[PDB]
Write a protein that binds this ligand. Structure first.
Ligand SMILES: N[C@](CC1c2ccccc2Oc2ccccc21)(C(=O)O)[C@H]1C[C@@H]1C(=O)O
Ligand SMILES: N[C@](CC1c2ccccc2Oc2ccccc21)(C(=O)O)[C@H]1C[C@@H]1C(=O)O
Ligand SMILES: *[C@@H]1O[C@H](CO)[C@@H](O)[C@H](O)[C@H]1NC(C)=O
Ligand SMILES: *[C@@H]1O[C@H](CO)[C@@H](O)[C@H](O)[C@H]1NC(C)=O
Ligand SMILES: [Mg+2]
Ligand SMILES: [Mg+2]
Lengths: 445, 442
């Protein structure tokens, strides 16, 4: 009985977005979700509607075959995503040709385990886990976002650029830190790099554990000034805090993964200790054409997004008479107010274009000379569509070239930043790692 | 379509058994399974039929409610088990009231993630993962086999019985080793035991890693003679082989989890360095009544088991397309016969289901003969509650019950590797750990 955002067309593309937060602890068994989300939820629902409209109006891509949608809420939760994925396949047990999403790797894995049983290709836009490259387990999965293994690669390229042969290695416990570090250490051993102090830090580690980590790192100075951190941001923060307690500054060169990236909250109150840090993050340029569409949406005319009323009330802290807020909505409020575009918007859009390019390629091969769908695509053969998707390529929404390797994995493009004192402290852009190629301003770093 | 072993009844019990081995590597995408299995497969299918027959004949348990079955093949594989679990619920898209199995914890987790969405209770007979006690994730899961956390408890009770105050600790990387050792350490930190050297290793790690392990261990001597190993067998083997390469013997007292248990392949070739080792394993008392039924099965009579002809041909190497001889239907099941070591648990899991149903009936249909409107259909969330509160005497005389997390009591054998009063190295039975009570003989 959960809401579904729909658009009819010749071929239906499924999607799972986090329209709401996960069930609160108490709401878990009933699968009742948390509050509505804009950036991970409403913005993505809307980007999908608008992208399908653009593809449909495009005479060059799928000229005679229209795309529709069936967009479901994952609530950033494995149980709900699975419940909703069953809804995709329920009638078969218009079928969906493939699925965009869900957002997180643990949830994407749950969904893939179901989808693959029905030969439904799945294209992720933000799931970066290294496990998902395993095609013996996840045959039907592919993605337009780089695997975290390319972080390990980039960080090692940075180390090698400056001719270091020893480094220390710290990671956070859990899939993200451990598999990222495992990838780094595997490459390091192949390429002549030696590990000094190695440590795995728990999510709940106290000040004493951090104190000790700092002691172990300082023991290897000065031979191992470089500390490679495949770390969640609060692991980095715990190290900075230990530095403060000991009263030491600037002994190390910290190289951090995107758990740290350019997050102010990691270094707030500890800028002096963090200064000099090198970090990476996914490149994600804003998509202007999304803003042009989204910022113009109106409560009264947006009928196709069934969650838009719930959103409008939350967004403008108001109520629609006929539940928590005093103000009565006018419908004339401005979405520009405090507006921030989903940082992953470009990947969401490219994943949808990817689905469209796979279908076009399928049509060229299976229905040559036939206007629109032919019998060979009635219904669409998911196993064949997977093959076509993997071999598809195109220029994505920000000018980058989108394509997939044999494992369904994407190329990687990261920004390299260096925390610096300015005249405030800023994460200064010092270069990029672009599809295997590191480029850094050595002078600025 | 994959075969299904069925039996009609008023209430249908699902089951997933490893009737076949998992798909060979090249078969994985088509979900075509490996070869037929006896102990993990065919025996379990049969025990389920016969147990249901026995319950249905019983005048006291479920008087005028017949239990049926829909037994499916998991092929010891997440993907196949999930495909088959989807088949169970296809009805809702006679419904299944609950599910027995599958065998492995990682496969059981995958099945539970699907079953819980349809409020179908699931009872495991061999999935021992500590993870499965998390009722926020696995609300509809319960089991008649002890969580591996009770191995850690039993191991600590052994350590304390001998007044040891310091131990070293080794575990295999991954869920089994890490979760077992986390439990042990958590208990040790509550009860005055100190950990000297602590280490983790993969089974596939090289000799250089085991060299470093043993080197690191020997440094914490002479005060840390005892090594607690929550280890898969090949981790123990990696340590025994590092011991030979250094030429050391009898310097440690090894206390091993059921990864080691009484396995010959762990110690073969290293009997002398493994000697004196202490291990535990789940008790598995043989079920006489299963032997009496199973050993009398005939190819021509057994029509309800669709896998029986495939099993017969493989068991007696004949045809009815790989072997030359034609099966008579007369060959004896008693040759090289071994009963599934988990047979007691399989049966108890089935009885647990029946008792849950009975208790639901007593409460919801009080005084009624057979199913009343309140149990048409069976409300899975209610049945879960009734299962959790059920208790009964199991097939071997043990008391079966569940705590609030669906977890079972634990009974382990304790064994000691010894040089016998002959000239052979044997795993000798030295005691038991019975539901919190440690009993050892000198
Ligand atoms: N890329 C994410 C997150 C990525 C990650 C990958 C694998 C396992 C854990 C894990 O958690 C962290 C933690 C810190 C930094 C990056 C990750 C994904 O879940 O795939 C991202 C969609 C999730 C989101 O936006 O929250
Ligand atoms: N109890 C098992 C095995 C148990 C285990 C539990 C959790 C994770 C891994 C894991 O692997 C090991 C390794 C060594 C010793 C015991 C275990 C289960 O999978 O639950 C059961 C399937 C095994 C069977 O029936 O053969
Ligand atoms: C590292 O060594 C290389 C090769 O000798 C040299 O070209 C370069 O100057 C060094 N790199 C940096 C960043 O100093
Ligand atoms: C919204 O704006 C329109 C156009 O300016 C105006 O006529 C109308 O009164 C406004 N509605 C509300 C509820 O303020
Ligand atoms: Mg078009
Ligand atoms: Mg009866």
């Amino acid at each position: 009985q959960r809401s579904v955002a729909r658009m009819d067309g010749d071929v239906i593309i499924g999607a799972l977005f986090s329209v709401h937060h996960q069930p609160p602890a108490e709401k878990v068994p009933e699968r009742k979700c948390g509050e509505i989300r804009e950036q991970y939820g409403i913005q993505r629902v809307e980007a999908m509607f608008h992208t399908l409209d653009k593809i449909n109006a495009d005479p060059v891509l799928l000229p005679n075959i229209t795309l529709g949608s069936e967009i479901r809420d994952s609530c950033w939760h494995s149980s709900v995503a699975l419940e909703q994925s069953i809804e995709f396949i329920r009638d078969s047990l218009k079928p969906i040709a493939g699925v965009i999403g869900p957002g997180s790797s643990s949830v994407a894995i749950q969904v893939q385990n179901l989808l693959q049983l029905f030969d439904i290709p799945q294209i992720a836009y933000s799931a970066t886990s290294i496990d998902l490259s395993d095609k013996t387990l996840y045959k039907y999965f592919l993605r337009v976002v780089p695997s975290d293994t390319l972080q390990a690669r980039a960080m090692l390229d940075i180390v090698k650029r400056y001719n270091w042969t020893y480094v220390s290695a710290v990671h956070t416990e859990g899939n993200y830190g451990e598999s990222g570090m495992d990838a780094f250490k595997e490459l390091a051993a192949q390429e002549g790099l030696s590990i000094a102090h190695s440590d795995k830090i728990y999510s709940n580690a106290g000040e004493k554990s951090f104190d000790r980590l700092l002691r172990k790192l300082r023991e290897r100075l000065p031979k191992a000034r470089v500390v490679v951190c495949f770390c969640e941001g609060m692991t980095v923060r715990g190290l900075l805090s230990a530095m403060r307690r000991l009263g030491v500054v600037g002994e190390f060169s910290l190289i951090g993964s995107d758990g740290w990236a350019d997050r102010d909250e990691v270094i707030e109150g500890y800028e002096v200790e963090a200064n000099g840090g090198i970090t990476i993050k996914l490149q994600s340029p804003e998509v202007r054409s999304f803003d042009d569409y989204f910022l113009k949406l109106r409560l009264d005319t947006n009928t196709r997004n069934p969650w838009f009323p719930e959103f409008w009330q939350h967004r403008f802290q108001c109520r629609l008479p006929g539940p928590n807020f005093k103000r009565i909505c006018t419908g004339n409020e401005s979405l520009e107010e405090n507006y921030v575009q989903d940082s992953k918007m470009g990947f969401v859009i490219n994943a949808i274009y990817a689905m469209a390019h796979g279908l076009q390629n399928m049509h060229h091969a299976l229905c040559p000379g036939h206007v629109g769908l032919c019998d060979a695509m009635k219904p669409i053969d998911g196993s064949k569509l997977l093959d076509f998707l993997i071999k598809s390529s195109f220029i994505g929404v920000s000018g980058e070239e989108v394509w997939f390797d044999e494992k369904g994995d994407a190329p990687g493009r990261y920004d390299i930043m260096n925390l610096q004192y300015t005249e405030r402290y800023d994460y200064v852009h010092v270069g990029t790692w672009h599809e295997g190629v590191l480029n850094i301003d050595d002078y600025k770093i």
